[PDB]
């Protein structure tokens, strides 16, 4: 009988409760809800739950499969944590930790002073920006340590917690590079052009160095409150422009300090761009007191 070979992540649908829509993914839905006893010590836990549309294509379900699986093996304060999986019945439910304020792009946009949904507080300060950069870098460094290239780092894929901690999310495009330290895409596929490195666009190659390039664009998204990168140029135009050595300007009044990291991230030669650990190292001295307490950078694991 099957009962004697259970999945440790299986969770009873009975423990899950949906409250509202947190957003819509390209082929599923993300809901906010609470789950009864899914974490030892917590009677109830606020959570985000991802579903998959009946009409989801094989490819999409295959991408959804990878997302959940790579996550099963992560454990880092700056990475969205997987909590359980409901598969006994339909529809399948993937339960993750709730990031109260949603994705960074949305969040950033709400802080605009004219935003119809401004929460009542000023745009991110220099300090709050370094903190974000530092948290995204840490999570990513952890990811790199585990030997995984994300391939799709952007504001939309970064989440913001109730306490405002930013964490890496959406691991659908993630790939193991353990043996070769790189991933070379084969055929055709939906790629996030406006966030890709030149070598990745030219030869379809992905490294932690290309992920560093995306980080820079995320810094840019951050300092412009999530405007559109290469605003006014079609994906085909950007592709040609970047491969020719092109890159983004510094958003208006972008902090000098932030502009520097972007200069480093967009070096044409991938080997010259910095690594995430070096990025946390550059900012470690101007962060919340709790950082050394939860960062991967400060943990014994980082060896």
């Amino acid at each position: 009988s099957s009962v004697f070979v259970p999945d440790e992540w299986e969770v009873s649908r009975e423990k899950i409760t949906l409250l509202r829509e947190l957003g819509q993914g390209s082929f599923g839905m993300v809901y906010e809800g609470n789950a009864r006893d899914i974490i030892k010590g917590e009677a109830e836990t606020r959570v985000a739950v991802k579903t998959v549309n009946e009409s989801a294509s094989l490819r999409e379900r295959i991408e959804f499969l990878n997302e959940a699986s790579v996550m099963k093996g992560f454990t880092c304060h700056h990475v969205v944590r997987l909590l359980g999986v409901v598969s006994k019945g339909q529809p399948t439910l993937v339960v993750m930790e709730l990031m109260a304020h949603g994705d960074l792009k949305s969040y950033l946009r709400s802080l605009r002073p004219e935003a119809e949904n401004n929460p009542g507080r000023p745009p991110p300060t220099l300090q709050e920006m370094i903190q974000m950069a530092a948290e995204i870098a840490d999570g990513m460094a952890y990811l790199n340590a585990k030997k995984f290239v994300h391939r799709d780092l952007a504001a939309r894929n970064c989440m913001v917690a109730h306490d405002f901690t930013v964490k890496i999310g959406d691991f659908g495009m993630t790939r193991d590079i353990y043996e070769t330290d790189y991933y070379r895409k084969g055929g055709k596929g939906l790629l996030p052009v406006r966030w890709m490195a030149p070598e990745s666009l030219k030869d379809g190659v992905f490294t932690t160095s290309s992920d560093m390039w995306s980080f820079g664009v995320v810094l840019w998204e951050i300092t412009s409150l999530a405007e559109q990168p290469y605003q006014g140029l079609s994906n085909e135009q950007v592709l040609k422009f970047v491969m020719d050595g092109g890159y983004l300007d510094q958003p208006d009044n972008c902090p000098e300090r932030v502009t520097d990291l972007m200069r480093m991230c967009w070096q044409f030669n991938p080997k010259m761009r910095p690594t995430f650990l070096e990025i946390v190292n550059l900012l470690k001295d101007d962060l919340h007191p709790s950082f050394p307490e939860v960062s991967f950078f400060h943990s014994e694991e980082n060896k």
């Binding site: 390209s26 052009v193 030219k202 379809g204 592709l239």
Partner: peptide, 13 residues
């Protein structure tokens, strides 16, 4: 769902 953020493609090289 930022669909516009993706382009169907194969390495130009």
């Amino acid at each position: 769902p930022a669909t516009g953020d993706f382009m169907n493609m194969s390495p130009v090289g």
